[PDB]
Design a protein around this ligand. Structure first.
Ligand SMILES: *[C@@H]1O[C@H](CO)[C@@H](O[C@@H]2O[C@H](CO)[C@@H](O[C@@H]3O[C@H](CO)[C@@H](O)[C@H](O[C@H]4O[C@H](CO)[C@@H](O)[C@H](O)[C@@H]4O)[C@@H]3O)[C@H](O)[C@H]2NC(C)=O)[C@H](O)[C@H]1NC(C)=O
Length: 359
């Protein structure tokens, strides 16, 4: 009945959204760390190839490794630029819009939870509208509903309650007086009229919206109405705008999975940086033919397909460095070394050796 406390079918879908929004900061931290990690892996491969070239310098194998080193250093460069230009804003915006909306929802739900007079009369009722619910740890009436922002650990969340189309559980409600409102539980947050609702001497001067514009509390003796939020469209200045902002920011997320962060399986000529380097440093002519690039490449890779690129990478990975450059009993093959700073100083050692050979 109108002007009565809210049954579980009303507030459980809000709990579900709040719990899922709680994971958006975790996903943002995961993605920012994953981007940095992938950049670091690209840089390690660039450094191994560079070290191999110095060790084997002046050979066709070394020139192949220079091409490989250039490729992976450009991947690392481009991932850092994308982290600056795109990923940082995407992940901060998702974190902020999700956390802001969660705060709007949780403040409303916490008010419902506390506004009660007895075990059978209050604003937050169970599924049958018989008993007011209580919070026990991170649950309310048996529903996960912490009403707090959890400690932020990296995690990959699975979009369930907020997806590509909108908030799946926040559907059009045709019969709120019977499906949202209890039969007898009293709740002055259920209307703006003075007899049973928020008005004191008279009715409130207008309808009131709560939960960032989701629910509309009329100032007459009538049931609430809700915005359907499951088939959203991009808009500006809506009463429920924070729902749209979080949905839009979440839909834009790519993770650390755009092309800068992934390896390329194309033929060698099409791999990042390869054609420009062949043209500028080997052919020494701009606007070259494809046949010429492929012909140059066979000199150094014995072919021009991904298989010949992998073969050079295996030679790079198997190359040992000088024993004294690693700790006692530690591995010396480049493929068994990782960490940018560790490989950077090994490259510097071999560049000094290269200088001493020219001396
Ligand atoms: C894009 O692709 C490149 C090329 O594949 C890739 O660089 C490669 O990274 C792997 C590591 O993921 C290196 O593979 C090594 O292979 C040897 C021989 O089988 C293994 O022994 C290695 O494992 C030992 O060493 C690891 C440290 O590196 C330890 O963590 C591990 O426990 C083992 O003790 C390892 O599998 C390979 O050498 C490089 N290749 C080159 C040319 O550097 C790069 O990481 C990819 N980029 C992204 C973002 O994924």
């Amino acid at each position: 009945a109108a002007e009565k406390g809210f049954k579980q079918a009303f507030w459980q879908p809000l709990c579900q959204v709040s719990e899922e929004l709680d994971d958006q900061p975790k996903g943002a931290l995961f993605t920012l760390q994953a981007a940095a990690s992938k950049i670091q892996k690209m840089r390690d491969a660039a450094l191994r190839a560079s070290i191999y070239a110095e060790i084997n310098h002046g050979t066709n194998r070394a020139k192949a490794a220079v091409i490989v080193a250039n490729h992976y250093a450009m991947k690392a460069d481009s991932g850092l630029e994308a982290l600056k230009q795109t990923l940082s804003s995407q992940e901060v915006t998702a974190t902020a819009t999700a956390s802001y909306l969660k705060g709007r929802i949780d403040e409303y739900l916490n008010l419902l939870l506390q506004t009660k007079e007895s075990g059978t009369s209050g604003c937050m009722m169970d599924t049958s509208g018989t008993n007011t619910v209580t919070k026990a740890g991170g649950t309310i009436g048996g529903v996960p509903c912490k009403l707090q922002l959890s400690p932020i650990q990296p995690k990959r969340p699975a979009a369930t309650y907020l997806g590509k189309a909108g908030y799946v559980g926040l559907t059009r409600q045709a019969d709120a007086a019977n499906n949202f409102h209890a039969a007898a539980a009293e709740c002055r947050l259920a209307s703006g009229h003075n007899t049973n609702g928020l008005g004191k001497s008279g009715q409130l001067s207008a309808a009131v919206t709560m939960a960032a514009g989701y629910v509309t509390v009329a100032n007459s003796q009538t049931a609430v109405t809700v915005q359907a939020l499951d088939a959203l469209q991009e808009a500006s200045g809506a009463a429920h705008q924070p729902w749209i902002d979080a949905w839009k920011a979440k839909k834009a997320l790519t993770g650390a999975e755009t092309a800068e962060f992934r390896n390329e399986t194309a033929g060698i000529a099409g791999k990042t940086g390869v054609t420009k380097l062949v043209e500028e440093a080997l052919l020494k002519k701009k606007d070259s033919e494809a046949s010429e690039i492929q012909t140059e490449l066979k000199k150094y890779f014995s072919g021009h397909e991904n298989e010949q690129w992998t073969a050079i990478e295996k030679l790079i990975s198997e190359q040992p460095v000088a024993q004294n450059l690693v700790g006692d009993n530690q591995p010396t093959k480049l493929g068994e070394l990782e960490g940018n700073a560790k490989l950077t100083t090994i490259l510097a050692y071999y560049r000094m050796e290269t200088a001493g050979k020219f001396e």
